[PDB]
Structure formats: C-alpha cells, structure tokens
Amino acid sequence: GSXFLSPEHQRV
Amino acid sequence: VQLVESGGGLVQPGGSRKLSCSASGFAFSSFGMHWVRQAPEKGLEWVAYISSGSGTIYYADTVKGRFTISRDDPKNTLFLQMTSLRSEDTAMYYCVRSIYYYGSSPFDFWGQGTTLTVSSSDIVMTQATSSVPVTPGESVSISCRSSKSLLHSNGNTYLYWFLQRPGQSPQLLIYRMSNLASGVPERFSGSGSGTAFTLTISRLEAEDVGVYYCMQHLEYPLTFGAGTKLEL
Amino acid sequence: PAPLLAGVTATCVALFVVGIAGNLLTMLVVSRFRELRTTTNLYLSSMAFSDLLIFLCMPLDLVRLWQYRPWNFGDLLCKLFQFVSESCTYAKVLTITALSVERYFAICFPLRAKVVVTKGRVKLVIFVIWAVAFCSAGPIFVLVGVEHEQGTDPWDTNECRPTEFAVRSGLLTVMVWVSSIFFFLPVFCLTVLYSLIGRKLWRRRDQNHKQTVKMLAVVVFAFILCWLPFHVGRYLFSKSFEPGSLEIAQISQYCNLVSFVLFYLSAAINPILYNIMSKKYRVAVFRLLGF
Amino acid sequence: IAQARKLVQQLKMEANIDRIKVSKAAADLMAYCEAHAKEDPLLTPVPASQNPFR
Amino acid sequence: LSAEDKAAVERSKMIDRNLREDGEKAAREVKLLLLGAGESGKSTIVKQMKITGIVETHFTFKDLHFKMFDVGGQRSERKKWIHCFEGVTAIIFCVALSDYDLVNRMHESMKLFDSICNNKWFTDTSIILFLNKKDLFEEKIKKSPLTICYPEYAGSNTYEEAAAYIQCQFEDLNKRKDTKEIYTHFTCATETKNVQFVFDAVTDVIIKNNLKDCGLF
Amino acid sequence: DELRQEAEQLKNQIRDARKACADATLSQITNNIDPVGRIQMRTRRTLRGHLAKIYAMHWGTDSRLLVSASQDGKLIIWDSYTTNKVHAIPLRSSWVMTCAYAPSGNYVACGGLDNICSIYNLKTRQGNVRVSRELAGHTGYLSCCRFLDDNQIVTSSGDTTCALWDIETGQQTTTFTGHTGDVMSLSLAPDTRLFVSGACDASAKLWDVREGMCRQTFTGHESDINAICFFPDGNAFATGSDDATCRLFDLRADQELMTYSHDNIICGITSVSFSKSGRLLLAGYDDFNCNVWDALKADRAGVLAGHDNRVSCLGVTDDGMAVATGSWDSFLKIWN
Ligand SMILES: CC(C)CCC[C@@H](C)[C@@H]1CC[C@H]2[C@@H]3CC=C4C[C@@H](O)CC[C@]4(C)[C@H]3CC[C@]21C
Ligand SMILES: CC(C)CCC[C@@H](C)[C@H]1CC[C@H]2[C@@H]3CC=C4C[C@@H](O)CC[C@]4(C)[C@H]3CC[C@]12C
C-alpha cells in the first residue's frame, strides 16, 4: 500500500 | 486374541491406582479401546474410551476429571489412571476392543477383568424383566427399551446385545440390532422397532444361562440395560 | 494532474484483470492436477492467494487516490484494507524468498533436497510465512485510522491516513524502517542464491542453462524494479511529515503513485514470471480451458 | 505339427453346434431391455429421495 | 449427524495419513528400469549390488535408495505393460559389444533400443546406456572386422575407433534429442565406477527434473 | 499340409453356417424402438487417496464397497456412500494390473507383472488384512481375475492362457488354452457356468468352467481386445478393442450383432460394462472421456468427461444405481 499524502500538508 | 488386565486390589478411599490391559494376538494399534466396570452384584457400566491413534477420548460423567485413559501402541498396553478413588468405584474393570469401519463388529472381545476394591440427557436403556426361569429347548425373547430412538438417519439402529456367562466376561451376541456376531450360533436373533427391541433365543442350551445386557452406541456416554437373568 | 489519474486507474484495472485471471488459473490448475502439486506450485498457490487479496484491496486504494478528504467508509474498513494489503505484501515477498530458497536447495543440492524437503516441511513454511506477515503488519491497526480536522464536522474532512500520534511519536518512521527489512532481506537472499545457482549451472557446462540464468536475472530485476520505488516512497512519506520539507510534498506523492502502479504490476506479472516456462503448467491450463 | 491337429479338432467341435437366427436372437435382447427398463436407475434418472448419492 | 461414523471417519483419516507418509517415502526412491536384449550384460550390472516376472533390486549408494526393475523375465507383449514404467527416473540399457559377430544380435539390440527410446511413454525419460563386453570386444575386432555388422564402417579394427563408432550408432538412434539424453558408459572391471556412473547420471537427471519443476528451463 | 487345409476349410464352413442365420440385423429389429435420449450423469463422489495410476476397480455385491488397485503398492477398499477408506492393503509387488472383490465380500484379489494372484482375507480375528493365498502357476502377467466363490477364482494371464484356481490348495484345477495372444480380460457369466476371455489375437473365446473347453470363438475385432463384459441376460457379451470400436456378440447366434464406433473416436477402449437393464453400454476410452452407448440402436447416449487421464477401469453396481470410473489421473469417480 503506497503511502499517499493529504492534499493539505500546510503544517501551519 | 487375548486381553489381560492387571492393577487391581484393595485401595483406600481417596487413593490412586493404575490399571493396565496387555493386548495380545491382534493389531492393538488399529482398535479403539474401552473400559467397562461392573459393580459387585450389579450390571455393566461404561467408563472411558480411547480411539485408535489416541485422537478421541471420552469419559463417563461419573469419572470425568478423575480418571485418565492412555494408550501404548508399541507396548500393546492400555492404561487407566484412577485418582481420588471413592467406594463407588469398587467394581470389575473390563478391557474391551472395538474397531469402527463399515460392517465392523464393535465390542467383540472383552478381557477377563481386574477387581478393584475401594474401601470405605443420557439415553436410558430399560430392561423390564430381571430374571426369567427357562428350560432347555424353548424360545425365549429378551426385551429392551430405550428412552430415545436408536435408529439413525443412515439406517443403522445401534443396539448391541451381550451375554455374561457365570464367572465370565460379557460376550457380544448381536451388533447394530440384527447382525449376529462372529462365532455365535444362529439360534440368536435380534429385531427391533427403533425404540423397543427383542432378542430371541430359538433353542436353549446349558451354555446360554447368564445375564443379557443391551447397549446403545448411538451417542456417548454408552449406556447399558440392567440385564436380564436366565436361569434353569 | 487531473488527466494522469485516468491513466493510472485504467492501468490498475488492466492489472486487476490480468492478475485475477492469472492467480485464479494458478490455483485452479494446482487444485485439480496432481502432477502440478509440487513444492514450487504450493508456494505459487500461496502467493496467488496473496496477490488475489492485494487485488481485492485495489478498489479501496483507488478510491483514496481518487477522493481523499471526504472519506467516510469506516475506521475498521480503513484499518482492514491497509492491513490485509500490508500483510499480503509481506507474505508475497516472503514467499518469493521461500521460492528462491527452494530453487537453490533443489538445484545446488539435488539429492539432499529429496530427503530434506517434503510437503510436510513446506506446509509449515507457508504457515510461518503467513503468521509472520500478519504479525509484522499488525501495527497498521495502531497507525492507520480515520481522523477529522477541527473547523468542519466529522464527515466533512475524514481522511484514511496514518494517525497524528504516529507522526508526533516516531512510530511511522520506525515502521517504514522495519518494513525495509522486507526489501533488504529478500533482495540479498535472491541475489546471492540465484547467483550461486547460475555459478553452478555455468560450471557444469548449453542454451538451456543460458535461458535459466536469463530467467533468474529477469526475476531479480523485476523484484528490484517493483520494490525499490515502493520502499523509497514510503521512506520519503516518513520524511514528508517532518518540518522543512515542501519539495518532498511533490516527490513523495509522485514516487508513491509510481510505486502504486509498480505494486499492482508486480501482482499481475508474478504468476506469469514463475509459471510461463513450465510446460506442464501450460498444458494443464490448456486442459482446464477449452483451447 | 501337433498343434494343427488340435486346432482341427477344436474347429470340429465349434462348427458342430446349433445356431439360432439373428432375428430370433436380437428379439430376445430387446425383450430383456423392455422387461427390465423400469429397474434401471441409469436409464431413468431416479429422484434424489431414494438415491444414496444425495 | 453421525455416531460410530465419526470413528469411521477418524479411521479413514488415520489411514490416508499413513498413505501420505508412504507416498513421501516412495518419492525419495530412485526407480530404474533395466532393459536389454538378452542376459549378455544385465547379469553384470546387477552383480555388485545387494538387496518370475519382475526382479526388483534395492540398493543404497551415498545415502540414496535405488530400486532397479529387471523385466527381462516377462515373455509377453511389451506394449501391453510397458506403460507401467512411464514415471521411471531413468532407463538402464545394456548392450554387449561382442554381439556384432554373433547371430544380428547387435542389430536386434539396436531395434530394441530404438523401440524403447522412442515410445510415447518415455518421451522425457533419460537412458543410461551400458556397453558391456569391453574386454571381449577387442579380441573380436582383432579376430574379425567390424564390417560384419555395420558394412559402412570406415576405420581400423582397433578398440577406440570401433567402440566410438558403436556408441555413435546407438546415440544416433534417438529421435527425441530435444527432451532426453543418453548417458553412455563402457562397462569397466572396476565396478565402483559403474555404480558411480549410474549415481552421476541419476544426479544429472534429478537436477534437470528439478529445473523443470521449478520453472527454470 | 493334408490337415492344415482342413483348418482353413472348417473356418469357411463355420463362416457359412453363421451366415445362414443372419436373416436380419440387430439395427433392423430395433429400428422402431424409441431412443434412450440424452443421458446426463453428474459426478457424485470423487474418491481421492491414490498417489499413482489406478489400474483396476471392482464393485462389491452389496453395491456400496469397492476395491481399487493403483501402481503405488496399495489396495484401497472404499465406502462409496461416505467416501471413507475401509481398508488400505500394502502389496508386496506394486505392479498390480487387476483387482477383484469376492461376491461374499470376505476376500479381495490382486495381480500383475509378478505373475501371482494374491488373495487377501478381509475378515480376520485380528484387525489387519492378511494374504490368504498366493497363486503362482502363471508364467505371464495377470490381466484379470474374477471370483466364483470364496474357494474358486478364475485368472487370465499374458502367457495366452486362463486358469481356474482352488484358493485352499493353491493349485490350478483347470487351464484354458487356445488363445494365441495375451489374454487381457475376463467376464464371468451370471450363472457362473461360462466365461469369456478377450486376448491380443483379436478374438473372444467362450469358455465353460466345469469341463475346461472353448465352446465358441468370436473374431470380429481388428485389433487387440482389452475389455469384455457379459450382458445381464448372460446370452451376449460386448468387447472393447484397440481399434476404437466396441462390438456386441451373441452366444446363441455365434456372431457379431452390432458395432459401436464413431468417426471422432480413434483411441482404444480400456473398459466395458453394461447397465442393469443392458440398454446402455459403458465404455472407457484413452481420450479421457467415457462414452455411453445405446446397446440396442448403436447410438451414443452420452459422454462422461471428468478425468484428466485414461479411464483405465469401469464398473457398474449390481443394483444399477451408479457407475464408477477409475483413471490414470489417480482418482475414482462415482456417476449417477
Ligand atoms: C533480520 C531479522 C530482523 C529477521 C527479519 C525477518 C524475520 C522476521 C522472518 C521471520 C520468519 C522468517 C522467514 C520464514 C520462512 C522462510 C522460508 C524459507 O524457505 C526461507 C526463509 C524465510 C523467508 C524466513 C526468512 C525471514 C524470517 C527470518
Ligand atoms: C487474509 C486472512 C483473512 C486469511 C488468510 C488465509 C491463509 C493463511 C490461507 C488461505 C488459503 C490457504 C492455502 C490453501 C491450500 C493450501 C494447499 C496445501 O497443500 C498447503 C497449504 C495451502 C497452500 C494453504 C496455506 C494457507 C492459506 C494461504
């Protein structure tokens, strides 16, 4: 299962 | 075929004992083995069973958790380790061989028995008569009844009949209601309705007196009738 | 960005059909034909079952590469479709390692193998592999769980992504490193054993031997190509959740979709890779089918 | 040479038999089939109630 | 749903378990079919090893169990029973080198070899060919020419040229060159070497079979 | 010679005598009877447990227990109803080509390339199967064996001869000589007063058990006869040969009655059996698919296709309920 990133990696 | 039982004697209540049955003259490893006790001046009672290969072990409710049955195939020995013995365990213990395949005669050979003297839902099989006075040469019918129908869906009615001659181990006469055992004369015949069964002796002999027991093999624990006595 | 997803989904569906067909054929042939019930076929049957579940989990993963933020399929589902996936992956790689070991013992030590390896000692290997695969992927339950962001209600932004506990504590990074064993140990085992088999075959002499070492090299190359991007991607996903990383925002999500296509490509091609050159298998698939 | 004489005697014993006509012999096989048609489970698929294989 | 039928099922499983165990033990065995067109050399390829239809010979070499079936005693139609040995590991064929001047016998052995090698049952079964009577062969070739059996033989009447010619003539009879091999050994007085040859040929056969099973060919 | 001519003169005399009786063919007589239609038989039980090729099977007279022989040296007795193995007998010689089950059910026999018929006692005071007797007179492999009673067995052999054996004494009571080729099959008559043997000389010979002579010889087949079965009436039999043709012979008419052949079928027949009525002829083939033939109209009623290998043996139960086909793919199937 390929890790996928949230389209919201704002890290704010 | 020979089964010799050892280990009996006078045991104090609460004590332990180990019973051994040494099989001789047959393929011991391929036969399922049973322990059947007979209390003094009382009838047969099933105690325990071990399958061939020791895969399946069953015990009576009376002895469950106290008695353990084990098998030694290389040494042809059957064991019954009895712990926490009480005075109701005073009986004659019999070693029985039974093989199960289509057409098999289960319970066909019984050992001579060992005497143990401890000091001080189940299917009910009913035998109405306890004693029958007989004369040689006549027909005798021995009736047995069961709480539940012994006829199974496969067509087999599992009612076995045994004769215990005086001072001798019980011998198998009829298996699965109608089948006559090996070596038994054809004077004996079994017929039944699935809940009520009869055993007919066509002509008597002096070698037919004894107690006649009916056993069911429909389900465990295996239960016996009180026994019908034949006297001259 | 928007059109690429169409290609990646269509490729996945194609791999889905090819993989399911191959795995079903493998299992059916092994089940019905006694002559094909060999140790190798037993390993491939287990591997076929593993690929079958990796494929059954494809619709859920394809959903997330399609929609991520509105996910409302359930927390138990989110755990289950990433646990069976990461468990079957680890059994798939372990089964490949077991096939390489069996091939090495069968070829390098032919007579000793006949005594040592038996179906009894192959069923045990299958059980051990499956147990290890399940145990290794058990922490996915403590890691992959639906989470919601404040400011919108629960259904509005749930994403089936690893928890934030896994990201604040170094749980993820540790488990992307623990998974890396599933790459390093098989790649080393396959390369060393296959090279030894090639050495022995070459020393003995033939065109057939050349074909054999070509096949061994092809399986090694397919393993490396399929799996190295996957592990690199998951390691980049671990670093992505760290501060100072915005370039890896693009790098991981792209390496991770290339690693998605390769991941399903592996399952589609593996029955073909290990069974195409077995004449008994081909004649039995022809016997099983009308053709 | 001994074998040939035995073959001659055997052909003597096989030739001197009474043969019935094929018409009067084929008619007996059909009669056996019609008479025993009902008691053939293979010809007529028996209902599963009295079939021992389910 | 069952009663003393559970006990019957248990008996059935115990005996099929024994059947499975017996099958594994048999699979470890190496089975060899010994053939030939007389007792010219078969008796010598059975003399060293210690153990009416089929005479089976069981011997162990290097911790491997071999079963060798001599079917010469079966005077019957071969095509009716030859399929029983379809799964034999290898076929051992014995040819006497001194039978080229005797009657025809060398031709008969070649006919038997061609028939056995090209059966539909032995398409992939390797053959270990033994050329016996090596000691006798030199005396015959120094007494008579080799052209008595093979009229097209151009060469001297010496052991090496004649014996290599016969080996070629036997190895050229196989039409299944793409699937099977013929392992030819000239039977020697040192019998540690005949068994060694058989062991080596069987090891090669097992390796090739294992490669076929693994899917690497 | 003076008497070699008489051999080929008598054969013509027989050919003429059996042509005077051929007034009408069996096809003509059964032209207006109705066809059996399409026979659809589904596999009910699959008996698995034999590791190698299954070479022979025989049903018991109780129609439930069957014995099967395989090249692995095991003789398994099966319970068809429950698929349970009642017994597994290890054989001294694994090259077993035939097996028979006694009518009583107390004994089984097997034989093969060792040239010995071994009788196994199934009902013993112990719980094991023991070798009761090993019959050794035959000088060729045993192709078929059939029990007459507990103490009498008839065995065919590949040395071109058949023999009647006394199990108690182990001696050949009677030897049947006359086949030039290897004898491949036997079929006992329902009365057990006659039996037929098919050999590799493409002839089927009728043999009477009591006086040991061959009453009739049937030579329609063009190739080796591999299977023979009596009709339930006992007045006809059917043979199976390597020429991909089954034919039916009448004892009383002394000639072939009808031929069962199809253009699509080019492989030999390994086993032949009849249904309880006799209407259906079941033949095993090398195409991996069994074929059902209408015995009266020579039509092919149906096909039994459930093996991946040659259907080496075939048997129908005495009550006609099921047919069992064993095969070289290591599996026995029960069809109904
Ligand atoms: C290096 C350390 C961390 C070990 C990592 C892997 C561990 C957890 C696992 C546990 C179970 C093991 C696997 C179980 C079974 C097999 C099949 C065998 O035919 C080859 C080895 C192989 C594939 C083993 C190697 C990997 C293994 C040792
Ligand atoms: C994913 C979870 C829910 C289920 C996992 C089930 C696994 C452990 C099961 C399902 C099917 C099983 C296989 C089915 C049949 C065989 C053939 C046998 O000769 C050896 C074992 C083997 C190869 C089994 C191994 C274990 C197996 C792969």
For chain F, which residues make up each domain, given as ranges?
2-335
With an 8 Å Cβ cutoff, is E8 touching chain B? yes
- Residue C30 CA, ligand 1 centroid: distance in Å: 25
- Residue C187 CA, ligand 2 centroid: distance in Å: 25
For helices C247-275 and C58-66, the axis angle rounded to 10 degrees is 160
What residues flank ligand 2, with Cβ below 6 Å? Answer: C 42, 45-46, 49, 53, 84, 123, 126, 130
β partners of residue C14: none
Q: How far apart are CA E12 and CA E19, in angstroms?
A: 10
Show the domain range for B172.
125-230
| Cβ within 8 Å, pair C114-E62 | no
C222: enclosing H helix or E strand? helix C207-240
Q: How far apart are CA B67 and CA C129, in angstroms?
A: 41
DSSP state of F151: S
Domain boundary among B61, B87, B118: B118
Which of B84, F334, E150 is closest to F325 using CA atoms? F334
DSSP string, B193-222: -SSEEEEEESS--TTS-EEEEEEE-SSSSP
β partners of residue F58: F67
Specify burial of residue F5 (Cβ count, 10 A radius: 0-12, 13-18, 19+).
exposed
CA atoms within 13 A on the CB side of A11: 12
With an 8 Å Cβ cutoff, is F264 touching chain B? no
- F324 by DSSP, 3-state: which? strand
| Cβ within 8 Å, pair A3-C57 | no
Question: Contact F320/D39 with Cβ under 8 angstroms?
Answer: yes
Question: Contact B177/B167 with Cβ under 8 angstroms?
Answer: no
Parallel/antiparallel/unpaired status of strands B131-133 and B228-231: parallel
CA quadruple F110, F116, F117, F118: dihedral sign: negative
Which ligand has an atom closest to residue C27 CA? Answer: 2
State how far residue F289 is from chain D, nearest Cα, in angstroms.
18
State how far residue F315 is from chain C, nearest Cα, in angstroms.
23
DSSP string, F75-100: EEEEETTTTEEEEEEE-S-S-EEEEE
**CATH, residue B51:** 2.60.40.10
Which of F99, F126, F94 is closest to F110 using CA atoms? F99
Probe residue for ligand 2, chosen from C130, C134, C135, C140 as the CB with the greatest number of ligand atoms within 8 Å: C130
End-to-end Cα distance, chain B: 31
Torsion of CA F318, F320, F322, F325, to 10 degrees: 70
How many CB pairs lie under 8 A apart between chains A and C?
A: 47
**Which of 3.90.550.10, 2.130.10.10, 2.40.100.10, 3.30.930.10 would CATH assign to domain F2-335?**
2.130.10.10
With an 8 Å Cβ cutoff, is E6 touching chain B? yes
Question: Contact D42/F39 with Cβ under 8 angstroms?
Answer: yes
β partners of residue B18: B81
Is residue E57 a known part of a binding site?
no
- Residue B178 CA, ligand 1 centroid: distance in Å: 60
Could you give the number of structural domains in chain B?
A: 2
F contact residues 164-223, partner B, Cβ 8 Å cutoff = none
End-to-end Cα distance, chain C: 43
Q: Give the neighbor-by-neighbor strand order of the sheet with F117-121.
A: F96-101, F107-112, F117-121, F130-135
Could you give the number of structural domains in chain D?
A: 1
**Is residue C116 in contact with ligand 1, taking CB distance under 6 Å?**
no
Method in brief: cryo-EM
CA quadruple C81, C82, C87, C90: dihedral sign: positive
D34: enclosing H helix or E strand? helix D23-35
Contacts of E188 (CB under 8 A, 6+ apart): E134, E194
Parallel/antiparallel/unpaired status of strands F269-274 and F280-285: antiparallel
For helices E105-117 and E159-171, the axis angle rounded to 10 degrees is 40
**Is residue C132 in contact with ligand 1, taking CB distance under 6 Å?**
yes
DSSP state of E64: E
Residues in chain F, overall count:
336
φ, ψ for residue F153, nearest 5 deg: -140, 145
Single-letter amino acid code for the residue at B83: T
Domain boundary among B50, B85, B118: B118
Resolution in A: 2.7
Q: Which residue of F has its CA nearest to E21?
A: F51
Residue with CA closest to ligand 1 atom 3 = C181
Question: Contact D42/F320 with Cβ under 8 angstroms?
Answer: yes
Six-digit token string for B164 = 């215990």
Torsion of CA B130, B133, B134, B139, to 10 degrees: -50
With an 8 Å Cβ cutoff, is C114 touching chain A? no
Question: Contact E11/B52 with Cβ under 8 angstroms?
Answer: yes
Q: How far apart are CA E67 and CA E31, in angstroms?
A: 5
Could you give the number of structural domains in chain C?
A: 1
Residues in chain B, overall count:
232
Which chains reach chain C with 3 or more Cβ–Cβ distances below 8 angstroms? A, E, F
Parallel/antiparallel/unpaired status of strands F300-304 and E90-96: unpaired
Question: Contact F72/E23 with Cβ under 8 angstroms?
Answer: yes
Parallel/antiparallel/unpaired status of strands B188-192 and B131-133: unpaired
- Residue C46 CA, ligand 2 centroid: distance in Å: 6
Residue entry with tokens 């395949």: B101
> Quick one: which atom of ligand 1 is closest to the CA of C102?
19
Tell me which chain A residues have a C-beta less than 8 angstroms from the C-beta of C237: 3-5
Which ligand has an atom closest to residue C49 CA? Answer: 2
Q: How far apart are CA B208 and CA B206, in angstroms?
A: 6
Which of F50, C289, F155, F135 is closest to E19 using CA atoms? F50
Six-digit token string for E165 = 């010619």
Contacts of A2 (CB under 8 A, 6+ apart): C61, C230, C233, C234, C256, C257, C259, C260, C263
Show the domain range for D3.
1-54
Question: Contact B80/B5 with Cβ under 8 angstroms?
Answer: no
**F65, F123, F126 member nearest B102 (Cβ):** F65
Six-digit token string for E213 = 């099973």
**Is residue C185 in contact with ligand 1, taking CB distance under 6 Å?**
yes
- C132 by DSSP, 3-state: which? helix
With an 8 Å Cβ cutoff, is F295 touching chain D? yes
Q: What is the separation of C-alpha F105 from the centre of its chain, rounded to a whole number of angstroms?
A: 19
Show the domain range for C198.
1-291
Torsion of CA B54, B59, B63, B65, to 10 degrees: 60
Torsion of CA F25, F28, F34, F39, to 10 degrees: 40
For helices E191-214 and C75-108, the axis angle rounded to 10 degrees is 160
**Is residue C97 in contact with ligand 1, taking CB distance under 6 Å?**
yes
DSSP string, F207-229: EETTT--EEEEE---SS-EEEEE
- Residue C92 CA, ligand 1 centroid: distance in Å: 12
Parallel/antiparallel/unpaired status of strands F236-241 and F246-250: antiparallel
Q: Based on the domain organization, do B110 and B143 belong to the same domain? A: no
Tell me how far CA of residue E83 lies from CA of E107, E209, F55, F142, F242, in angstroms: 24, 20, 11, 15, 15
